[PDB]
Every structure is written in C-alpha cells, then in structure tokens.
Design a protein around this ligand. Sequence first.
Ligand SMILES: Nc1nc2c(ncn2[C@@H]2O[C@H](COP(=O)(O)OP(=O)(O)OP(=O)(O)O)[C@@H](O)[C@H]2O)c(=O)[nH]1
Ligand SMILES: Nc1nc2c(ncn2[C@@H]2O[C@H](COP(=O)(O)OP(=O)(O)OP(=O)(O)O)[C@@H](O)[C@H]2O)c(=O)[nH]1
Ligand SMILES: Nc1nc2c(ncn2[C@@H]2O[C@H](COP(=O)(O)OP(=O)(O)O)[C@@H](O)[C@H]2O)c(=O)[nH]1
Ligand SMILES: [Mg+2]
Ligand SMILES: [Mg+2]
Lengths: 428, 428, 12, 12, 201, 201, 426
Amino acid sequence: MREVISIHVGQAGIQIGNACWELFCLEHGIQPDGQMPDAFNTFFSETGAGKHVPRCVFLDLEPTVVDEVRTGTYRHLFHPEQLISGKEDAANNFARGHYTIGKEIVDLSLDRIRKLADNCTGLQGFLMFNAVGGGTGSGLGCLLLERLSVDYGKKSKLNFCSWPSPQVSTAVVEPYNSVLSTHSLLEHTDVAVMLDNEAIYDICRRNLDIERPTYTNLNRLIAQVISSLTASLRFDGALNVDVTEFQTNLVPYPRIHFMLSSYAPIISAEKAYHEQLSVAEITNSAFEPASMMAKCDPRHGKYMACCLMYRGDVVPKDVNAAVATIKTKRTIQFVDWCPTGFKCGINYQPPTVVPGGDLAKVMRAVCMISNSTAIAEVFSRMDHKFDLMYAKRAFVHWYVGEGMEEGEFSEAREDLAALEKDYEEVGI
Amino acid sequence: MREVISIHVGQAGIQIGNACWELFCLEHGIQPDGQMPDAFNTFFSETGAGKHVPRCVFLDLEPTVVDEVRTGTYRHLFHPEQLISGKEDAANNFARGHYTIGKEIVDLSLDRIRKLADNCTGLQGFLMFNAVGGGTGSGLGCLLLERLSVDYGKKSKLNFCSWPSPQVSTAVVEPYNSVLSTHSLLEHTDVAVMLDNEAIYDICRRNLDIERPTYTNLNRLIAQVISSLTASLRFDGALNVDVTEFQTNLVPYPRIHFMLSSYAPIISAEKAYHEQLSVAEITNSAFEPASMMAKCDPRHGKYMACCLMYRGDVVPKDVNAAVATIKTKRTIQFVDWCPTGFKCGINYQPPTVVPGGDLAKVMRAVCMISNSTAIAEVFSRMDHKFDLMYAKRAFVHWYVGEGMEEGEFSEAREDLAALEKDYEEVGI
Amino acid sequence: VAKPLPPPVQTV
Amino acid sequence: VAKPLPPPVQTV
Amino acid sequence: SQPVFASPLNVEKRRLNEERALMQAQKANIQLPPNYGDMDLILFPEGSLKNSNNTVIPQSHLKGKSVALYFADGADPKCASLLPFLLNYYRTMNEGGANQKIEIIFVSLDRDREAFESHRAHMPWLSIDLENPLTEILKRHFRVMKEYEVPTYGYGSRTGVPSVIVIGSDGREAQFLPICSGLEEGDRALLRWDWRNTKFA
Amino acid sequence: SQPVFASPLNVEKRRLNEERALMQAQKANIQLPPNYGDMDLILFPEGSLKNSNNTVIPQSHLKGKSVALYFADGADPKCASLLPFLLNYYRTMNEGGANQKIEIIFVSLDRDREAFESHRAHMPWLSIDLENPLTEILKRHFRVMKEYEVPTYGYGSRTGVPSVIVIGSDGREAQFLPICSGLEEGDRALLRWDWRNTKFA
Amino acid sequence: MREIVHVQGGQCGNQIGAKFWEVISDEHGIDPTGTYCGDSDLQLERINVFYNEATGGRFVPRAILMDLEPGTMDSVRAGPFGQLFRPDNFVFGQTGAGNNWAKGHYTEGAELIDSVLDVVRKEAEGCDCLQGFQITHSLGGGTGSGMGTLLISKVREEYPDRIMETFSVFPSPKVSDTVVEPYNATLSVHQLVENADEVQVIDNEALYDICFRTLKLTTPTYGDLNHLVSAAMSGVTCCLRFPGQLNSDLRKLAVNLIPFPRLHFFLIGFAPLTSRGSQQYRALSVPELTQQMFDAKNMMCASDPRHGRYLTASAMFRGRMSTKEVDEQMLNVQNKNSSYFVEWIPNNMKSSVCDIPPKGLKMSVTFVGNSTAIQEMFKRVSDQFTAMFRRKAFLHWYTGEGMDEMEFTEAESNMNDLVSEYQQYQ
Ligand SMILES: Nc1nc2c(ncn2[C@@H]2O[C@H](COP(=O)(O)OP(=O)(O)OP(=O)(O)O)[C@@H](O)[C@H]2O)c(=O)[nH]1
Ligand SMILES: Nc1nc2c(ncn2[C@@H]2O[C@H](COP(=O)(O)OP(=O)(O)OP(=O)(O)O)[C@@H](O)[C@H]2O)c(=O)[nH]1
Ligand SMILES: Nc1nc2c(ncn2[C@@H]2O[C@H](COP(=O)(O)OP(=O)(O)O)[C@@H](O)[C@H]2O)c(=O)[nH]1
Ligand SMILES: [Mg+2]
Ligand SMILES: [Mg+2]
C-alpha cells in the first residue's frame, strides 16, 4: 500500500525529478541499476531479484531532454518505456502543447500511468512536477490534469510548479503561458506549491554561499523539499502525516489551494559545525522572509495555515515550544478565523546528503509548506505582464494559427481576477 | 543564562576584538579552532562536538581590517557571517557612516545580533566597542545604537569609547566626528567608559616599560579591563557584581553615566617579582592620578562613585582595609551626596597570565570603573577644536555633501554644552 | 554520476 | 596559548 | 569503479582482487568477480610519498587526516596564483587545533625534473616523484590534464590544472574543490573542504 | 606544531611520533594522528651540545635551566654590539645566586669553520657546530635568517641575525626577546628575560 | 572590492606611469609576462585594485594608455614591462597634438575622446564599485593638458561621486622647454579647480633637485625622475593595496586635506631616500623619516614650504613600526615648527600606517599636504602668462582652431582667484 506516482512534464520537470530519483535511490539503498546491496514501496516497486524500478512517467515533447536520461548513469534504473518522448518541441506555445501535438503523446502517457496504478494497492496521490511558463509544462501539463481528473478522480493530484519569477524569465511569452495554464492549476490540482527560480537563487547565495549555482543546485534543494514532504510515508515518525492531511489541515475554502515552500537549513558545510541546529532556531530560519521560495515576502499578508515537517532527532516538547515562540512573534500574522494553524509533523530519520552536493550533514530539518494571502501578489505581477502584452494582441498569431480561439486569453483573465478577489476576501 | 554580546564597530573595534576574544578564549580554555581539550556561556556557545563559537559581531565598512581575521587562523573560530564587512569605508566622515553607506550594512548587523540574541536564556548586556575619532566607528556605530535602543529597550548597552586624545589625533577632522557623535553616547547608552590612546601610552611607558608600544599593545590592557568587568559573570567570588549592578551602584542621575577605567596591577617581569603586589599597593596605584586611562586628572574633580574589582587571591579583610586608607587621604575627594561610594567585587579567578605579550604573572588584580566630575574636561578640550574649525566652516562641505544638514553641527555642540553644564551642577 | 551509497543506519 | 588547569582544592 | 571505470588504478585493483578471489575459490560459495566494495587497494606504494625532508613515509601514516591531491604545474599562472593561498590554508587549519586536519599530496604536471624540484621546494606538504608512474596513473584516474595527448576512453576532463581533489583510502573522489571548473570558485573553493566527513581511513 | 608547521624539525617530530603511535596501535580505540600535547621529541641529539672545554654534553643536562638559543654571525656589527651585553647579562645573573639560572646555546650563521671557531672562542656557553644539520634545522624551525636564500613557505621571518630566543622542552616559543623585532630595542631587551616561567622541563 | 583605474595621457604621462606599473608589478610579484612568482598571501589578496584576471591566470593592469601620436606608446610597448597592458587599451590617434592645448581639448582630441571614454567605460564600469580614477599627465604639452583635461571633464559628469586623483606635472618655468608652457598650464588649471578631487603638483626641477642634492646622481635621466614620481603614486594608495595597523583610503586623504573644495592642490614628497655611499651610514627610524619628509627638498614640487603655511598635512607611513612614534613625531613637528602650520585648524596632522614596507626598504613614508605656498606656482605661471598676453603672443593657433578670446580671460580669472583664496588662509 501507500504508493505515490510521480509525473514529470517538461525540461524542468524532468531535471527536478532527476535530482529527486537520485536522492531517493541514494537514501533507500537502491543503486543506479535497481539492486539493493518495505520502506521503498512509496517510490519504487520490486521485481524478483531486487530489481527496484521508480514509478515515474517522465514526459517531454522534444527528445533532447530525456535522451540523456536513457543513455547516462541512470539508464537501467529507469524503465525504458516510462521515459516518453515526442519528436519535436512545444516552442513555448500553450496551444501547441494543448491543441496540436500532444494528443499523440497523452494516449501513451495515460496508458503507462494506467499500468503504473495497476501495480499499486492504494495510491496516496499523484505527485507532479511541471514548469508553468513554457510549452510542455504549461500546455501538456494542463492536458494531463484534464484527463487525470476525469479518469482517476477523487485522488490527491499534488502539483509542484516552476511559476515564472518577477525579474528573471529567460523567455518573453511566459506572461502568456503562466495564466493560460492556471485553469488546470486552479480547478484540477490540490496542493499546488509555487516555486520560482529567483527565490532559490537568493537562497543559494545567502546560505549555500554559491555565487554561481546552476539548475543542478536548485533541483537538489527541491529534491530535499520533496523528500521531507514524503518522509513519514517512507520512514517511521513520532507524528506521521500523509497527503490526506495536507489537504485538510492546510487548505481553507476549496478554491484557495496554493502553497509556498520553505526549507531549513540550507546551510553550507563550512558554516555547519559552527552553529546550533535546535528546533527553535530552525523554525526561526524557516519563517524568514528571505527563505520563502516564491519571492513572495510574507510580512505583507496573513497566514491561513502552516504545515511543519520537522525531520531528524526532534523531540515533540521542543516543537510545541518552538511554535509558541513563532506565535508570539509580531511580524507574522494569522487570519481571525484560524485559532490553530500549525499542523506539525515529525519523522525520526535524519535527512540524507548526496555525496558531492552543496549541502551538509544535518541532524534536523524543517520543510514549511504555508498557505497565505501573500501569494495573491505572484498572480498580480503576471496580471501586469499579461495586460501589457495583450493590450494590442502580441504573439497571438502563433497561438491562433495552431488551434486556439482568441477568447481563451480573456477567460484566462477573470480566472486570474476571481483568484485575486478570492485571496483578498479571505483576510477581512 | 549569563550571556553578553559584544558589538565591535570601527577598525579599532576589530583590533580590540582580536585581543578581547583572545583573552576570553584562554580564560575558559578554548583552542584556536574552537575546541576545549559552564563558565564560558557569557562569551562562547556549545555547537555539538566541542565547538565554541564566540558571541560577537565585527562590523566595518572597510573590508581590509576584518579580512585579516578572515584569513588568519580564526576564520575557523568565528562564524563566517559574524564578521560583517562592506565595500567602501566611511572615510573619517560621520555623515557617511550614519546616513549614507551605513544604512545598507545595518540590516546584516541587526539580523545577526538578533540571531545572536535568540540563543540566549537571559542576556545581561551589549558590550559595544568603538572609537569615536573617525568614520564607521562614529557613524554606523551611532546608528546601530539608534536601532538597538528601539528594538531592545530594557536591555542595557555598555559602551567602551576611544575618545580623542588631547595632543595625539592621527586625524584632523576628528573633532567633528567626536562632537557630532555625543548623542549616541548620551541618550542611547547606559554606561560610557571613556578611554584614549595617550593614557595607555603613558602606562606602557612607565609601568610596563615598553618605550615604543604599538596599538596591539594598547589592546592588551583594554582586554584586561573587560576580563575584570565580566569576572563575576563567569567565575565565583566572595562578592559578585553583574552589569545590572555596575549601572546601579555607580551611575547617578541618568544623564551622568560617563565612567573612567583604571586597571592597576600593570607590571612586567623585570619588576614584578621584586615587590609585594598585595591589595594595599595595587589599590593605591589604582587611585593614583596618573594611571587613569583617560588623560583626565581626578585631582580637580570629585569622585561620585568607584567600582573596585579585586581579582585573585584577595581576602575581604584586606579589601575593607584598603578602602579605609584611600578614604582618609585629602588628595582624593568625594561629592557630599555620597556617604558610601564603593562597590567592591572579588573574583576568585587569578589574572590570566600573558605568554609572550607584555604583562607578567600576578596573583591578584584590581580595576576601577569610577564616575567623577573630572570627566567634564575631556569634552572641554574638544570644544576648543570644534569651535575653532566651525568658525570658518572648515571641512563641512564633506559633511553636507551626503545629506548631513549644516544645522546638526550647532546642536551637537549645544548638546555637549548642556552635557558640560550638567557636570558642574552635580558638584555644588 | 554514480554516487557512493551512504552507510546503513544501524537500529538504535 | 591555552593554559594548564589549576589543581583541585580538596576539602578539609 | 569510482570515480570512473577506464583508469589504470581501477583495472589494476580489479585484476588483483578478482585474481585473489579466484585463488580463494580454488583453495575453497564465493561469487566471481568480487564486489567493488569488497575490493581492497593500496592507493600508494611503499616508496612513493616524500615530505619536505625527502624521507619516505608509508601510506598508513595518513590515517585520520583529510588528504587531497593537488595537480599542479610549475609554470602555470593559475597554479602560481593559487599556491600562496594553499600555503595559508594549510597553515590556518594545521596550526589552529590540537589535531592535524589536512594533508596535501602534490602531483606534478611539470615538463621536467629540475623545474619540478624548483616548484616543489616552495611546498611543505607531501609530494610524489615526477618520474614515478603513480602520477601518470592518478592523472588518468581523476581525469586531469591540459591537452589531449593522453588518450581518454570516451570520457572527458573532470577538471583542468590546478586541481585540489579530496581523496579516499581506496581511491574514491570524496569531493572536488572547484578551483577552475564549471562552478568556478577561484580562491574560495578551498573553504568547501568538509574535513570532518572526508577522512582517510 | 609550535611555532611553525612547516619546519623540518616538526615534520621529523610528527613522522617519529605517529610512526611509534602506529606501532603500538598494531601492537594493541586510539586516536590517530597523535595530538601535539602528547607528541614528544628530543630537541638536541646526543652529540650536539658543546661546552667551552670542547667536551660533548646531552640534552638532559639542561634541567631546571632557562635555556635560550643565540643565533649569531661574527661579522655582523649587530652581533658585535650585542655580544658584550649578552656576556654581562649571562655573567652577572648566573653568578649572583646559589642556583645556576640560565644557559645559552649558540647557533652560528657564519661563513665557514674558521670564522665559526674564531667567533665561538669569545663565547663561554654552549654551542652547536656549523657542520651539524641541527643549526640549519633550528634556523628553519624558528625562522631566523638574514636574506631569503632558503625557501620559507609563504610564511614569516621572526628575526634577523642576531637573536636570543628562549626555548621549551618541545621546541615551543616561550617568549621572544625583542632585539631586532617589531619592538626594536638593541642591547636592552635582555632585561625582559624572565627565568622563572620558562624552565627546560 | 575597490579598484583604481589608471589613465595616462601625454609623453610625460605614458612614461611616468610605465614606471608606475613597473613598481606596482614588483610590489606584487608580477613578472613581465603576467605570471606571478614568489609566494605570499598578502601580495595577491588586494591585487584587484590594479590588476584583473584574464582566465589564463594573467594579471593585466588597469591601464588606459593615451597620447595623440604613435610615439611613446610604441616605446612603452616595446620596452620591458610593456607586454602587460592590453593592446586594446592603446588608443593611438595619428593626427598629432603639437604642444597646443586647444588641439587635445577641442579640435583633434574630440574625435578620439569618444574612443578612450568607450575604453574606460568598458574597463571601469564593469565591476561592482570602483574606488576612483588615477590620471597621470603633464600640463605643459598639448596631449596631457588638452586631451587629459577633456577626459577629466567627461569622467566627472559620468561619475560625479568617484575620486579623481591626478598626478599632474606642472610646467616648472625656471629651466624648461617649449615656448607655450604658460598657455597650456593656465588653460588647464581653470578646469582642474572644479572637476578634480585631488591634484598632486609635480615639477621637473624639484625632481632634479632630489636627484642632485639628495641622491647625488651623476646624470639624472628622465627614467630616474619618473621612478621618484612612481614612488609617491604607489605610496599614497598603499593602505588601499595592503593591510595595516591604521588603514586609510583616498577618501580619507580627501576629507582630511581639503578644507574647501577649490583648495585641493597638494605638495607631494617621498623620502627614505639616500645617496649611494650613505645607506650604510644612515639609520632608519620614525624621527629620521620625519625629518626628511618636511624639510626643504623632499618636495617634488618646486615650492618652498617655508614660504607659506600648512593648511593641513598628512603622512602615509609604511612598514613595521611603533604606533607611539608615528603619533609623537607628527606632534613634534607640529609644536616645534608652529609658524609653518595654520592655527584655525588645530592639530593639522593625519598619520596612517601600512604594515608591508616597499621592496628592499624597511620603512618608507609619503607626504601629501595642502600648503598655501602653492600660490607661488600659480603666480610663477601667471606672471609669464600676462607677459605674453599683453602683446597677443603665440595665439593664432589657439584662436584659429575654435577658441574665442573670452576663454583666455576666464583662464586668468579662475587662477588669479585661486591664489587669492590661498591668501585668506595664510
Ligand atoms: N528550477 C528550474 N527552472 C527551470 C529549469 N529549466 C527551465 N526553467 C525555468 O522554467 C521556465 C520554463 O522552462 P522549461 O522547463 O524549458 O519549459 P518546458 O516545460 O520544458 O516547456 P518546453 O520548453 O516547451 O519543452 C523557463 O523560463 C526557465 O526560466 C530547470 O531545470 N529548473
Ligand atoms: N585602542 C586602539 N585604537 C585604535 C586602533 N587602531 C586605530 N585606533 C584609533 O582609532 C582612531 C580613529 O579611528 P579609525 O582608526 O580611523 O577607525 P574607524 O572608526 O573605522 O574610522 P574609519 O576607518 O575612517 O571609518 C585613531 O585615533 C586611532 O588612535 C587600535 O588598534 N587600538
Ligand atoms: N617627468 C617627465 N616629464 C616629461 C617626460 N617627457 C616630457 N616631459 C615634460 O613634458 C613637457 C612636454 O609635454 P609632453 O607631455 O611631453 O607633450 P604631450 O605629449 O603633447 O602631452 C616638457 O616640459 C617635458 O619636460 C617624461 O618622460 N617624464
Ligand atoms: Mg523544452
Ligand atoms: Mg573605518
């Protein structure tokens, strides 16, 4: 029982889960071929003579992101057909990932998801990694949520997105792709966690001291965040918590289901042996505005709920004293209709380190998945991006000429605008 | 429990921290890495496997003098962001330190002081070390008092100044930075110890008999001042004094909080073993009006209070005999509103011996933190320089250029004028 | 690359 | 440098 | 098998260990060939290391000390820039503390013996003689070179000279300090030395 | 590891100490490499020290003494000025008492044997002859030098010739007598010598 | 973290700064191929002030070589230590500026200034925060006086926060060459008063004065007297380049030596100096460097400090020394020689201590002071200028290439009032 299927769509989805499966195999003991020289049942199956295979469905339209995965070190670990590729790219078009090519690929991805679920004996939920602000992560990701809801309904379709940063973008059509993908990000997903490149960039400078980190070092931190989020599932904890309680004791009224991630400590090895790592200090660092992984400063806003993922040699009486210190802090605030908003969680196992990664051996870690009204502003900034492009129909011939009716831009606008009104009426 | 945080600012602040934190390291047994091969709690912490991180912030707008501790042996002792540096020096400009380039480094200084205060279970004082003769020590140091007095209100803030000497300046705009920075050390400072370089030069000349001493030798004796000051916070004794009781049994009416230091078992090994350095002789050399660490003669001022800190194999019967013989002499005089004017404190710990430095092995010590009305002359000597310079508006275009209005020069002189007027008013 | 496996966590 | 430790004082 | 497969150390240790496994099977339920973890290696021979006094120390003398290979050139401007800094790092860790922390083995890519000696005289940590084949073997093992006269086996260069790579007892790459690599921390990659968890056992 | 990590005396001390430590490690939950507090050596071998009658004495003779090395060069006007005051100080502070207080060991920085003997004939206390490697190893151990011929490893020079340096049992630096130093008092720094706290134990 | 960008203009400027990059190189162990020999942490930790990396390990100087001729910049390149500078940072110009100030400033220098400003914007703006600019030129020719001040004007408006330290070489008129020295000198001074933070006045005759009555040379050549200038250029920025007990900065000099913004013309000097048969006769202590740092001839400008007063003064000591002597000697010169020291500023001295002495020496010191005796340099050029000006001297070159008559009277006004402003504080 208790199986979690991970779905990765896009370049960023493949590369993030690339660090995830590296960390999962290194943690449980599975080598890059499958062999171990039933805690693995959450992310692996088991075939005969210890041939553990990940339950991933890596998905992209271009082959030049996934072909390296099937020719490098982890080519025999992964099942050869789970890595699904089309032939040409989505060209950063939503409509080319949703209205032209992709129908030849979703029939292959849904079938392999079907065999991946037949091997299960009770799925906790569909963990997902995508990149909103592109062609495959936006368009083909939206198509996957449409089909997964109608087929595999009443199941926990978690999502972890790569929402475009306020300043660093690496593209010009992400104002179009981000809010045109937020339909499935609002009506289909459940624990949609917002991540962006810029905030993990600033974390890597401040804590990890890396002045020049790359897509590797960001995906390592996201892999540790996912490892902490599914930690009582794989390992024994004093206060276990599953994906069902993330959807109940962290989520208000149903349309409000966007989170914001945080991790602590992300501190480097040269710093590591110089300071305390007590649970009161680590939740002070986890509640720092600069450690927020959305560039979405929570000093302005109101916390509706907060989920804490203490992990390691963590004593519960020290946890309750730590959250009492957080409650007595005046910088952060909680909404009036939430007396207790501090669902905690403890897993006994200390977090693992990859040999050669940027992190250090740490006794305790906290993953702080919080829902606030501050995250209205990450949609307010793309609201400003969209009406500055679409005011005179920019880049729309590329989308109408491939299948998209012109009004789909405008019903992406009150989909965002009702999202803003909903987040502003919660805190009253 | 029993923690004190030292706050070094200005280049003299780093160098005085190199000697003080050195002495605190030996006086509890910490090796240069930070490992002992709980008296240490006021100065160091406990970071797992014997690691001992100091409780300090080394703050400077110029990286050069904080880099020599970052590149010497003690990068591994100090936590590497407890040594906050900058890009451009304030450059002998109180305007630059307090309004212009100190307001970007003040964020990292207050964030680190907050982190250094969150691991405290009862904090006694902030031992700020600075030098009011220059740039960031006069500027950013003043602004750090403004931020500290508003977030930590009940907290006491001790302050070891390095007030300009009469005939030795090493800076010509020094009278401007001294007078303009009185308000930080008048309304946002609870203890203001006034030191100057010449008095240490004279003590090193006739007592230690080093004819040609360097600033590193000046940092020898000021290190011995804080060791006797925080002696009772760390080791047991017959009578103990904490920083609450220094600022109670010594400080009169709240504006008068300006004290003078006089350590006096200063001796070196060629003299040391020839004489009895017992309680009577070390306290007569303490009250001698040429061993003041101020270049300020007490023979024209009235002792309002005195704090003798005997430190070693000192018996309390000899303390009460020594306070009798200093009270029966006419050359030492007291204000009429003082029947009792001594807060004697004994620490059983012997003075820490100095291998390879300048002092010698002495079995007992004494340090005075005495408030007198003689200290109304260390500011009158700097009045004459300020009025001479500001008569012709000399050097003031450098001040007004970064946003320091010409008005503040007049009421900084007027604030020191009311400071002088307050001092002969007590002595009537 | 093929990273070395961490040592096994002995039960306590 | 680091010092040696003072000897313990036995009670009488 | 670590860090690569096509290196003289790996083929040589593989040959010795599975020859030992065949000998044990002949004098014998043993699996052939042995596991990589079961393989044991002497990383350095008897007379390969010399200190500043040019006296031979054995490989077992390096226990408990975080040791790193330093692939260096005498005439290279990056190596000549990095060397005083490595001297200061060696001092600042090996003076401040009761226990010795880090050792640095020196592997030379210098053109000839006398310039190797001139570069090595400025350097107080351990070194390997240039004409010894162990230097050439370590170059192929850790993939360090300036230009491809050395035939790589379909691989690439892990890094270029200068290189400070922390090494293990059986020859694995513990961690790479990125002096001149894709991460590019000149002067400050030495601070990434995790001497607590990199130990020569 | 005092005062200098990069000294031949300390690298020989380290090699001997952890060689012996490994020997009883295999002979016998022990700490390796041994810490410098438990590390031990002999600073002067059996045939090194030489008194005024040219008869050899060993190291254990200096128990209860305040022992200082005198690095000196005969042709130096520095040393020519310093020598009579060193003679006076040694004379009067060793004659005035019931216990022999200090002892001085002479290390030569002379041109040759004839100049060494001509300079040592004016000098009554102990000496180490120039052909001994002990003089050159002590020069590199305590960083006394007139001009950079011998490579110091990006490190300092404590003094130029001459100097009196009091020494400990394990080669530590007890205190520096500031003749040619950062303090600069010629023929007067000898009064800073305290013979109490620096005993050869 | 802080960078000085050196721009050298003119035949005098290029040759002086070629010695400056030679002495900064061996202060930093740099071989004349870019490689670094000799092992020291302190000789590279603050080398970013004058050198940049080149992804080959080559330390390349921050030199912005300029002269309106393919002349002395060919000799700088072909000579020793000439391969260090980038060939890109060698802006040539082929038309020639024939000792005429309006040539470099108005009519030929205005078509190459758009390229040397592009070079200095590529090389100085491409960092986090530059400390300032260092300009070396002579106000006697046409290139240094004309093109040099044109770049000075453009840099102060593009970066109106940074310190421009200018080691100007004023025309010393007692013994000199070219007949248009007063025209080029005065037409540059009325620009250096506004848009120049520091101007160190250097005269060739005083460099010969050191070379004859202090060093006892046989034939003082241009290379020897360019070496003495480079001593002062390295010594001022010593604390910016090495750690010390009492660190300083070019802004610390500016705030402690400029009582009013127009008065910023300093007398410079540098002397632990000695003759050939006297370094083994002369000691070395703080009083001995002090007495050869005030006296009469150590000044590199031909202005007697006794014929005036010191408004303010500073001393950049270098090397291992006691902090008591570096304070007491500045007091001792202050109270013993009180007539040559103004009173409306009390205690007119800055001292500052480097820990690393220069190569070979044990301790050195450089003077920069704001002595009011600098009025006798502007007066010694004004009395030559008005002599030529009354009968309309060598002028049809200046007027013919785009200068009206009002520029020359405006040149006389802003330099006559500079002497008058120095009168009010003497
Ligand atoms: N965290 C992270 N962000 C990435 C990564 N790759 C790209 N991004 C950012 O995410 C946005 C989406 O880029 P992609 O991941 O290439 O989009 P996609 O899902 O691959 O869609 P297609 O490019 O059409 O295949 C880009 O604008 C990048 O800024 C990655 O590997 N990790
Ligand atoms: N006690 C002591 N005083 C020092 C030391 N170094 C400098 N000073 C004094 O500090 C005074 C001036 O302050 P600065 O040294 O310029 O340091 P600062 O406060 O950072 O000023 P800026 O560097 O210009 O920003 C001088 O009068 C010196 O006497 C030192 O090491 N110990
Ligand atoms: N110190 C020094 N002065 C020089 C040098 N060359 C020329 N001069 C002086 O500079 C003046 C001529 O100006 P110059 O800079 O050569 O002309 P420019 O090239 O047009 O700027 C003459 O009075 C020379 O004395 C030199 O190499 N060093
Ligand atoms: Mg793509
Ligand atoms: Mg400063």
